[PDB]
């Protein structure tokens, strides 16, 4: 649905985020032995939690935001959020000709690019597989001219079918409101709707 | 013992279970996932240093496999003395057959030239003896009046 951003529509300023918080929510069981060791096991999943806070909103901007959020609620579609700090627009080119091997799995994607991708990404840029909603952050990189190995922090929630393709640009966090239960906005004396903050969690 | 019919093996089993009762110690602790596979009657040797416990034979009494990975063990203390077993005494002359469920016949009998020789049965539940001849269809009746 693409939650409104200044890139999406700049005629309503102040709908830009004033504080973006990627909560690296990683549910995980840890035990602390007397031996000194720390034993820890990964189960469940890992949802990127986005904590958006908004400034005071004039009636027009808040009316538009209610329109979009009610469109989100009455429909079953997921919120899409673009984080500008990661919109580095490296890599560049097209992603149709790149191929991923048959079944990759295990937090490392080794994709080979023939001539269609021109540019080495930096460790820490978000990476997404075309078919599966969730977005991964890169932790290391290594290239051999055409074949470059990419290491991902989330452990590849989807397996590889053989037609998967990277995105590298314009990714959107598929998210759902976690504040939908009690979503209110006080309209002050001044006439500006205040205290409207959004808590978002991925819905891969 | 509902299932054991040997005097001697039940004797040894009673001795073993008595000594097992004599030991009677329980530990209860948790172990990490390294020790997966522990089974509720497996031998382990627990070696807490302060107690003075160097290798001490315990058989586990509980295992609680957990989704997280930790195992919640419970121990029972069985030294080698319970399994080493002991010696038993001969018990063969002290048999008690069930002789006391049938009436006994005349003690002696011979024919002296009538057939009188039958000594009264040791069973005092006796009323009338019966004599059956080869050709006489109607058997005789001799009655224990005294």
From Swiss-Prot, chain A:
Disulfide bonds: none annotated. Coiled coil: none annotated. Its main location: virion. The keyword Cell membrane does not apply. Keywords: Late protein, Viral tail protein, Virion. Gene3D superfamilies: 2.40.30.290, 3.30.200.190. The keyword Nucleotidyltransferase does not apply. It is found in: Virion. It comes from the Viruses. One of its GO terms (cellular component) is virus tail. Homohexamer. Interacts with baseplate tube protein p140 and baseplate hub protein pb3. Possesses OB-fold domains probably serving host adhesion properties. Forms the simplified baseplate, together with the p132 collar protein, the baseplate tube protein p140 and baseplate hub protein pb3. This is Distal tail protein pb9.
Swiss-Prot record, chain B:
It comes from the Viruses. Induction: Expressed in the late phase of the viral replicative cycle. Ubiquitinated by the Bil antiviral defense system when this protein is expressed in E.coli MG1655 strain expressing the Bil system. It is found in: Virion. Homotrimer. Forms a pseudo-hexameric ring. Interacts with distal tail protein pb9 and straight fiber protein pb4. Forms the simplified baseplate, together with the p132 collar protein, the baseplate tube protein p140 and distal tail protein pb9. Closes the tail tube and, upon infection, opens to form a channel thereby anchoring the tube to the outer membrane. These changes allow the tape measure protein pb2 to be expelled and phage DNA to be transferred to the host. Also forms the start of the central straight fiber, which is continued with the straight fiber protein pb4. This is Baseplate hub protein pb3. It comes from Escherichia phage T5 (Enterobacteria phage T5). The gene is D16. The chain holds residues 634 to 791 of 949 of the full protein.
């Amino acid at each position: 649905m693409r939650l409104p951003d200044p890139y999406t529509n700049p005629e309503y300023p102040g709908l830009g985020f004033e504080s973006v918080n990627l909560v690296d929510n990683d549910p995980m069981i840890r035990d602390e032995l007397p031996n000194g060791k720390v034993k820890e096991v990964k189960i469940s999943a890992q949802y990127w939690g986005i904590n958006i806070s908004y400034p005071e909103l004039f009636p027009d901007e808040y009316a538009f935001l209610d329109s979009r959020l009610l469109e989100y609620k009455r429909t079953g579609d997921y919120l899409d959020v673009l984080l500008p700090q990661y919109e580095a627009f490296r890599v560049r080119g097209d992603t149709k000709s790149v191929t991923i091997p048959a079944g990759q799995k295990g937090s490392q994607i080794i994709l080979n690019t023939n001539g269609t991708l021109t540019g080495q990404p930096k460790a820490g840029d978000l990476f997404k597989l075309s078919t599966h909603p969730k977005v991964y952050k890169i932790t290391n990189f290594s290239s051999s001219g055409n074949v470059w190995n990419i290491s991902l922090y989330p452990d590849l929630f989807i397996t590889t079918t053989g037609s998967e393709k990277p995105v590298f640009n314009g990714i959107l966090f598929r998210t759902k409101l976690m504040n939908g239960d009690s979503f209110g906005s006080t309209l002050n004396n001044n006439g500006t709707y205040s205290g409207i903050s959004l808590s978002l969690r991925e819905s891969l | 013992f509902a299932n054991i019919t040997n005097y001697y093996t039940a004797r040894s089993y009673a001795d073993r279970e008595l000594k097992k009762s004599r030991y009677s110690r329980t530990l209860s602790f948790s172990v990490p996932y390294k020790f997966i596979g522990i089974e509720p009657n497996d031998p382990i040797a627990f070696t807490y240093e302060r107690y003075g416990w160097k290798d001490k034979f315990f058989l586990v009494d509980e295992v609680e496999n957990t989704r997280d990975g930790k195992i919640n063990l419970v121990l029972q203390e069985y030294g080698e003395d319970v399994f080493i077993n002991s010696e038993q005494v001969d018990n063969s002359g002290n048999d008690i057959p069930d002789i006391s469920n049938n009436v006994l016949p005349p003690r002696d009998f011979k024919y002296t030239p009538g057939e009188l020789s039958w000594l009264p049965s040791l069973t005092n539940n006796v009323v009338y003896y019966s004599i059956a001849h080869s050709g006489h269809v109607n058997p005789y009746i001799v009655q224990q009046l005294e």
